[PDB]
Structure 1
Amino acid sequence: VLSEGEWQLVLHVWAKVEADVAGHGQDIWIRLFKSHPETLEKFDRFKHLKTEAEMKASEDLKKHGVTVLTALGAILKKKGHHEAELKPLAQSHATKHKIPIKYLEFISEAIIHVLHSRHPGNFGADAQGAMNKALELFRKDIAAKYKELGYQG
């Protein structure tokens, strides 16, 4: 359970992400797909992208990053009370997309790397720690839901 102070560190850096959610999403995808290429294979719609240039030029990939980060943002703003938000997410990711917890760890790593890079003003050690704590809570709760839905994760 995160403290209010920790949630504020998470929300303060997210406020910067919201200045340009599309741009942050693009950097996050490039970071993820380059660090862990296997994660790209899960996207039937984007698995043909061969280079960073192609990824950056993809309007649909950009749009999907907006969708993903906006959904994550809504979860973070709930400050732990995200039961309603996790239900549909866990169901599609467990049953349809089949995304292991390990891949959620990969994207969490990508998110943190991008925030560390773009936002040193609001992503110092304490802020990164709070963001990690928030993402671990997210994955923990998703893992529990995966279990209830019958997916090993």
Structure 2
Amino acid sequence: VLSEGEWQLVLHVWAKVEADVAGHGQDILIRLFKSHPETLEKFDRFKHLKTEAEMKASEDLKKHGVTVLTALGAILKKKGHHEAELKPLAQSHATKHKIPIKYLEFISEAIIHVLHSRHPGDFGADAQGAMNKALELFRKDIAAKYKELGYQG
């Protein structure tokens, strides 16, 4: 469970992200795909992209980055009271998109890295640890739903 002070660190940096949701979403998905190419293969929508320049030029990838970060921002702003938001996300990601929990760890690392690059003054070690806790809580709660449905592994 995050403390109130931890949540404030998380949402303080997240308010900075929302100034350029689309740029963040591009950086995050590109980092994910580059660092963990098995993740790109899960997207029929994106798997034609073979270079970082092609990824950066894709408007559809930029659009999806906004979809992803909007859903995550809505979860973070619930400060842990996010059951209604995780149900459908866990259901689609386990049963339709077939995304292992480990890949959620990978995108969590990408999010932390890009927040660090873009917001160093609001993403010192305290805020990095708090965002890591928030993303762990996200993964923990999604993993419990995957387990329910027979997909935790």
TM-score by length of 1: 0.98
1:14-62 alpha-carbon deviations (Å, 9 max, x no partner): 0010001000001111111111111000001101100111111111110
Deviations 1:58-110 (A, max 9, x none): 11110000000000000000000000000000000000001111100000000
Tell me how far apart the structure 2 counterparts of residues 149 and 90 of structure 1 sit (CA, whole Å).
9
Map residues 1-153 of structure 1 onto 2, 5 A cutoff. 1-153=1-153
Aligned residues: 153
Relative to structure 2, which stretch is displaced further, 30-39 or 85-94?
A: 30-39
1:96-129, Cα deviation, whole Å (9 max, x unpaired): 0011111000000000000111110100000000
Structure 1: gaps (5+ residues) = none
RMSD: 0.7
After superposing on structure 2, the runs of 4+ consecutive aligned residues of structure 1 that deviate more than 3 Å are none
Other structure's SS at 1:42 match: coil
Task: Measure, in 1, the Cα distance between the counterparts of 2:67 and 2:118.
Answer: 20
Instruction: Give the match's secondary structure for 2:121.
Output: coil
1:148 deviation in Å?
A: 1.0
Query: Unaligned 5+ residue runs, structure 2?
Result: none
Counterpart Cα distance in 1 of 2:2 and 2:152: 26
Alpha-carbon separation, structure 1, partners of 2:135 and 2:98: 19
Q: 1:152: how far off?
A: 2.6
What SS does structure 2 have at the residue aligned with 1:145?
A: helix
Q: Taking every aligned residue pair, what percent have the same amino acid on both sides?
A: 99
